[PDB]
Design a protein around this ligand. Structure first.
Ligand SMILES: Nc1ncnc2c1ncn2[C@@H]1O[C@H](COP(=O)(O)OP(=O)(O)O)[C@@H](O)[C@H]1O
Ligand SMILES: Nc1ncnc2c1ncn2[C@@H]1O[C@H](COP(=O)(O)OP(=O)(O)O)[C@@H](O)[C@H]1O
Ligand SMILES: [Mg+2]
Ligand SMILES: [Mg+2]
Lengths: 615, 603
DNA sequence: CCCCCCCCCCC
DNA sequence: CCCCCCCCCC
């Protein structure tokens, strides 16, 4: 055998099984003569035979590929297939429900990819990674973990036959450290890319950097039809395949805006839509507790021939399946913005859009990364509207004016432009992504804030530069707390004083806009109402007192009597619920990390010492 | 800033986790070979900063150490100081006691109270992944902590751990898989081998490797936890390690022998009527729940169906299935008004603690893996349990006095049984054993420190079959056997090696369904290559007729035929468990029957 | 200027 | 014949 017969048979082997051999033959031409590297040429070919056997095993295990006929991606798959075949990067943009997420991996398989390497397929959320993987496996009549596997936090079903591997973008970023060239994959699908989270942008930057060193790798950026040109120019003017099928125009009804109920507008819209022809209603909510209160309210009403279905992140597998079951009458679906573009709620014809969303945004006033509930962008509101366009005569009720909509900015800020650089640097450092200033971002953060973010991380003990940024074990712990680094540092210090509960209450409060209102009209009853929670020692302790006051009285009152209590005590109902959501999410993360949380409230003595760590 | 030395830096390694201490120690050993003292100093100055960094991981873990409490009612809780002192002062301890003592849930706490679990993890093995997850959830609950925190678990497909995990529940197979990336098991300062009396290949492999390992791991402590079945064998293995017997008071159980009268003349009705007669006999006794042992889940379903047709007064029939919901999985520990009859397999013999059981009914059988020399196949027959097992089943109604275990066989039948179950190592074909050791890197089978070595006359035969199948290959000086890609795929199939090769070959041709049909039929006794087609066609016919008529009407069909419904049921049972294993390995199975003679080329 | 591998493996 | 240190690499 010659050097060419062994080099060219590697192109049949797996990607990982071609690296250890192709640059392995170069060692054979080095020790300075043959007749010992002519018998090694014969014996390393035995290993090349056994390698190609696993390729044939994977081929023998590939299922027959089928597609639902009713999906635009199914109908248009030939154009998509030729675009993927002929370009290293393709932007696939299409209306929600076109079949991008469930059919794109199949098209990659039909094209022959996924044998010599895996087709990695990222999602923003673990629930979507798992749910998508079950669905494709089922469409192909396979078991999850066979041809279609998945890898999320706490759950990893990827066998030796797996060709498509669903995962969260977070999961894919964490694998770079161990596999700098991502050699496990021949194809990578970045899905829901229009969310422009830090994770997505981290992947888009890293992949663009990686491409020159991976001529065999193919990239498919999959997203809603929202300024996809930006993805295109980033990947050196990669083609954009717009895969939207037929969509019908949607009627937009504007329903803008002392004892009026907070949810009264939603009740009105619900009753109005109930008078329309059959079709389910999708209601966009700002969070889980808002969805809970709204489901409880709508049930109290006993809407005739109407069933209420709240989409919680904590929904069991039994509940998630009822979303796609046939149902008798009219169904009202309550969801956060996950069903905006990511989820595909079936049977939807009418939408109620309060117009707000929880979004991560750094406050220069408070010096804190926060989660303001602010009006959504036009592009975001148009996605919510678009969910009615699957059929004709869809109705979208917007709980705001037309002037308001026209005024709102066109697009949503990508997370990279609304996050303090300390958080960004910490994640990059934790992921081994390199120096923030040389990273090929799609859109770069403000370079003038890099030094401030580096100093903060040092002052917090998160990194070691006294050049060569390294995480400290404390820093590794901060990077896993999804709140502002300064606030998270305080939480980590509270565990040494047995007041993590209070640290999380205070952190939660500081991560939102002040729930204590003070309108122009009264300006005195609001002040006297909130003075019931002043603490002589610190402004922060007022939040703990207000927190304990709120907890006791959601127990003494019903869900409806509570909302009256909020406007009775000049408290923002939505912000209170958000305060409760964030604390719950934070408490679950903290406890999963083994950080001790005090059961009984720790007195205001040890809370002082722990507070004086942040700044 | 100032001069550092080997002595100073080495003294700081002891503030570190054993992993870090080992690494830095070997890094310092290298610096002893550096001829340039300036270079040594520079390395020291750098290494000292990293030691400072690494020592912080210990402080974070200490900050997460939970407060330890013990249920007052448990014998292990009541003897915790004696247990704690034995663990402290010995490198290996054998903790043996009746089921329900609190060995599984309280031992990991005891190690944490000793101070272990910080510089290394307390690994805790189980034979079943469900047990590993369930125990970790339980201890975490008892400690008022979230699973994945200080108490975590790692099983196939589900890893709930964190940087602060101190106790790590896992299957013994998970621990064995970790050996080839950590030969010293430096992740752990403590390893608890639970249910050790089951004497599976996995357990014996761990006991063998642990015994080899201990001289290289003076900072490691081992706790062998088992039922009270010949624990002196474990003691002798680990150089006469002390045995701490943690049972509470012993409450003798009354044994009634009720050999099955062949009154109906039907083997399946005759057994059901024996269970009915046992249930009657027991309901004439003081209040108490009944635990009926079964050999499979198909048997549980049929027997539970039968007992319900009886219209029993104020009695609930609770079947225990492996795939039970976490809702139905909870009710077994909850209060009930009347009498409850619980049907379970031998998972309820020693591993599980079904509460409130005063009476036991024991048919005396279980599925056991045993290599048949006649057929040259590793079979999974139902066979009479050992005396040790039947006493374990009897023990499960001895929580208080006046327990009654009814044995559906005679005393002579009981005495004819062997004193102990054969350990798996002594009833498994050597080809499977050698394959499994080679996949794990456990070394030559003739030098492995087995608790009980297999008969070495079979070793060369096993190597031959594994060479013929293409699972292994010998190399440079015929000193170590090495695995091939095919053999690794064979390592993952819990069936006979020759049958396993067939399953993989069926994957090429889309007839893994048929390969499983043949495989499960060969691992049992028939209800009756051209012979294998009879297996498939019988299977297909039975499946169709099973969906055609009711469950009751289907039993009438088997008896109006030269077919035994019991063997049919065990065939379907084995197949189902086989299909579950195949699916978890990502091997595709055809839905429709493979077309004719598509299997010929696969045999 | 320290640590470890193959028949994809480590101090 | 083939690679590595922030526990990495043909
Ligand atoms: N798990 C599921 N069960 C039933 N139907 C589903 C499931 N997932 C997706 N679908 C349906 O398949 C269609 C395609 O959805 P998807 O592939 O997510 O499209 P896109 O990613 O373009 O929004 C949708 O209309 C949806 O209703
Ligand atoms: N999952 C569980 N739910 C509720 N109680 C349990 C659970 N597991 C164990 N227990 C209680 O703890 C006791 C101790 O059981 P265990 O620690 O498994 O003892 P052993 O391992 O010695 O059989 C049991 O008898 C039971 O009362
Ligand atoms: Mg999608
Ligand atoms: Mg136990």
């Amino acid at each position: 055998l010659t050097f060419t017969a062994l080099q060219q048979r590697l192109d049949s082997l797996m990607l990982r099984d071609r690296l250890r051999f192709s640059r392995r033959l170069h060692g054979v031409k080095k020790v300075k003569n043959p007749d010992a590297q002519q018998a090694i040429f014969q014996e390393m070919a035995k290993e090349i035979d056994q390698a190609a056997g696993k390729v044939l095993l994977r081929e023998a295990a590939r299922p027959e590929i089928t597609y639902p006929d009713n999906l635009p991606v199914s109908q248009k798959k030939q154009d998509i297939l030729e675009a993927i075949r002929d370009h290293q990067v393709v932007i696939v943009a299409g209306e929600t429900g076109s079949g991008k997420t469930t059919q794109l991996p199949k098209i990659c398989m039909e094209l022959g990819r996924g044998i010599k390497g895996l087709i990695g397929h990222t999602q923003p959320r673990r629930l979507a990674a798992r749910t998508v993987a079950n669905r494709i496996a089922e469409e192909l009549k396979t078991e999850p973990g066979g041809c279609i596997g998945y890898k999320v936090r706490f759950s990893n079903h990827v066998s030796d036959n797996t060709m498509v591997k669903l995962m969260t973008d977070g999961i894919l970023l964490a694998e770079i450290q161990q596999d700098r060239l991502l050699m496990q994959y021949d194809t990578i699908i970045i899905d829901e890319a229009h969310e422009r989270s830090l994770n997505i942008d981290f992947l888009l930057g890293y992949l663009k950097e990686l491409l020159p060193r991976r001529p065999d790798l193919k990239i498919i950026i999959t997203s809603a039809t929202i300024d996809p040109e930006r993805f295109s120019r980033h990947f050196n003017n990669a083609p954009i395949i717009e895969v939207s099928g037929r969509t019908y125009p949607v009627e937009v009804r504007y329903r803008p805006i002392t004892e009026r109920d907070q949810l009264q507008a939603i009740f009105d819209a619900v009753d109005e839509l109930s008078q329309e022809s059959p079709g389910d209603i999708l209601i966009f909510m700002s969070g889980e507790r808002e969805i809970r209160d709204t489901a409880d309210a709508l049930n109290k009403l006993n809407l005739r021939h109407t069933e209420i279905l709240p989409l919680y992140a904590r929904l069991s597998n039994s509940e998630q399946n009822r979303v796609f079951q046939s149902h008798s009458g009219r169904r009202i679906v309550l969801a956060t913005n996950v069903a905006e573009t990511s989820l595909t709620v079936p049977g939807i014809k009418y939408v109620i859009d309060p117009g707000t969303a929880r979004i991560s945004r750094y406050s220069y006033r408070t010096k804190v990364q926060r989660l303001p509930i602010e009006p959504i962008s036009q592009a975001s509101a148009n996605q919510r509207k678009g969910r009615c366009g699957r059929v004709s005569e869809g109705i979208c009720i917007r709980l705001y004016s037309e002037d308001d909509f026209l005024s709102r900015p066109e697009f949503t800020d990508p997370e990279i432009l609304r996050t303090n650089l300390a958080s960004v640097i910490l994640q990059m450092t934790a992921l081994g992504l390199g120096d923030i200033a040389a990273f090929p971002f799609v859109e770069a953060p403000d370079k003038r804030n890099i030094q401030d973010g580096v100093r903060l991380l040092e002052e917090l003990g998160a990194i070691t530069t006294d050049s060569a940024y390294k995480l400290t074990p404390l820093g590794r712990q901060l990077s896993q707390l999804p709140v502002d680094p300064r606030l998270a540092r305080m939480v980590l210090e509270a565990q040494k004083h047995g007041c993590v509960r209070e640290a999380m209450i205070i952190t939660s409060a500081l991560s939102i806009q002040d729930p204590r209102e003070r309108p122009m009209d009264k300006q005195q009853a609001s002040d006297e109402k909130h003075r019931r929670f002043h603490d002589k020692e610190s402004d922060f302790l007022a939040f703990v007192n207000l927190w304990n006051y709120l907890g006791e009285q959601q127990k003494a009152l019903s869900s409806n009597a509570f909302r009256r209590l909020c406007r009775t005590d000049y408290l923002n109902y939505l912000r209170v619920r958000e305060w409760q959501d964030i604390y719950t999410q934070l408490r679950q993360v903290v406890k999963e990390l083994g950080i001790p949380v005090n059961s009984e409230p720790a007195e205001y003595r040890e809370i002082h010492i722990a507070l004086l760590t942040g700044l």
